[PDB]
C-alpha cells in the first residue's frame, strides 16, 4: 500500500538532513532554512528498532542438530536427512526472502505520507488567505518569520487569519 509521496510529489529531496530522517524545509524573507521533525523520525527509528528486536540479536539457541555435511553414500536415511535439511533450507530461504520483501515494502509504505498532519494543522489559517495549497511545498500565505516555522515544528500553531487576501 504505497502512499505516493517519497516517490511522488516529493520528487528530489535535499541531502543535508543528517540529524533526522524527515524535516520541514522552508523559505523566509530572513533566509530559507531547514528543520527536522523529531517526532516523526523518532517514530520511524523506533519502529525500525522494533523490527530489528526480533531480528538483530535474540536468536534461537539451537545447540545440537543433525549432520548436514556428508560423505560417501550410506543408505536411504542419509537421503532423508539431506532431503529434510534441504527442505528446511529452502523453506527458511523462501521465508527470509519473503520476510525481507514484506518488511522492505512495509518500511517504504510507512515512511510515506503522514504529512497530512501538517496539512490539517495549516488548513484553518490557510483556508482563507488565497485558499488551499497542497502540491508538496505548502505555499503558506501567512506572512511570518522563523517563529511561525518554529511553532509549526513545535505543533503549537494558532490561527491568525490573513483577511487582506481573501480571493486574490
Amino acid at each position: 500500500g504505497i502512499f505516493g509521496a517519497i516517490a511522488g510529489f516529493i520528487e528530489n529531496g535535499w541531502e543535508g538532513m543528517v540529524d533526522g530522517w524527515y524535516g520541514f524545509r522552508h523559505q523566509n524573507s530572513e533566509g530559507r532554512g531547514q528543520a527536522a521533525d523529531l517526532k516523526s523520525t523518532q517514530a520511524a527509528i523506533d519502529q525500525i528498532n522494533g523490527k530489528l528486536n526480533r531480528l538483530i540479536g535474540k536468536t534461537n539457541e539451537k545447540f545440537h542438530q543433525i549432520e548436514k555435511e556428508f560423505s560417501e553414500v550410506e543408505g536411504r536415511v542419509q537421503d532423508l536427512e539431506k532431503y529434510v535439511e534441504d527442505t528446511k533450507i529452502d523453506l527458511w530461504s523462501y521465508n527470509a526472502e519473503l520476510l525481507v520483501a514484506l518488511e522492505n515494502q512495509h518500511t517504504i509504505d510507512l515512511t510515506d505520507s503522514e504529512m497530512n498532519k501538517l496539512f490539517e494543522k495549516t488548513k484553518k489559517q490557510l483556508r482563507e488567505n488565497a485558499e488551499d495549497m497542497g502540491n508538496g511545498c505548502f505555499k503558506i500565505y501567512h506572512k511570518c518569520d522563523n517563529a511561525c516555522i518554529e511553532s509549526i515544528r513545535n505543533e503549537t500553531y494558532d490561527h491568525n487569519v490573513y483577511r487582506d487576501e481573501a480571493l486574490n
Partner: antibody
Amino acid sequence: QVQLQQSGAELVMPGASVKLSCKASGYTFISYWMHWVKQRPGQGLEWIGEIDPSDSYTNYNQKFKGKARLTVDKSSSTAYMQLSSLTSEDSAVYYCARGYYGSSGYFDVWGTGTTVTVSS
Amino acid sequence: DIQMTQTTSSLSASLGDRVTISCRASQDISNYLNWCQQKPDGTIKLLIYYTSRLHSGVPSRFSGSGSGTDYSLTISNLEQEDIATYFCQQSNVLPRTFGGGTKLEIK
C-alpha cells in the same frame, strides 16, 4: 575525504578585480551550502555571504553590498569569489567554508585560505 | 545587527586543568551557537553546533552549553594540542556574527 581545496595567493592593484576558487570534493555539491569567512590578520572572523549550489540563492552581509559576489559551477563542483574595487583595507585571508542548509549555518567543514594582499 | 562579544581577551591554564570559556550575545539567540577552533598555523575547525552537540571526530573532552544570551564552552582536561584561539558564532538572524576571539595560552 571532504576537503575544500583552495587556490594560492594573489597580488593586484588597488581598485582591481580578483577571482578566487574553492574546489569541493568528496560530497555532493548541491547538498550543503557554501559560506566564505574573511579574517584580517590580528582581527576577528567575519561572515560575508552564502550561496545555494542547487539554484544560486544569494544572501550577502549588509556591509558588503556591491563589493563581494558569489557564483558556483555545478559541473566542476567549484565555488567562486569575485571581488571588486579593492582597497588596502581588503588584505585578509579568505576562508572557504562548507555550510549546513539555510539559517542554521554551522560550518561543518572549513578550508585553508588564500593570502590576499592589496598594495601598489 | 547582533553585537556579539567575547569579554575574556586571553586566558592561561596548565595541562590537565579544567578551563571554562564563555561569551555573551546582545540579544536572545535561542540555541544556535558555533564554536570555532583556529590553530596558529591556520586550520579552522568547528567544535560545538546548535550550542549543545559536538562535531563528530572532535574529542569528547570538549563541552559547550548555555541558553538565552549567556553561553559557555568547557574543556574538562586540557592537553598540548588544545592551544588555539576560540570564536563563538551566532546564526539566528542574517548576517552571522563571530565572537571577538580569545587566545588560550599555557601558563
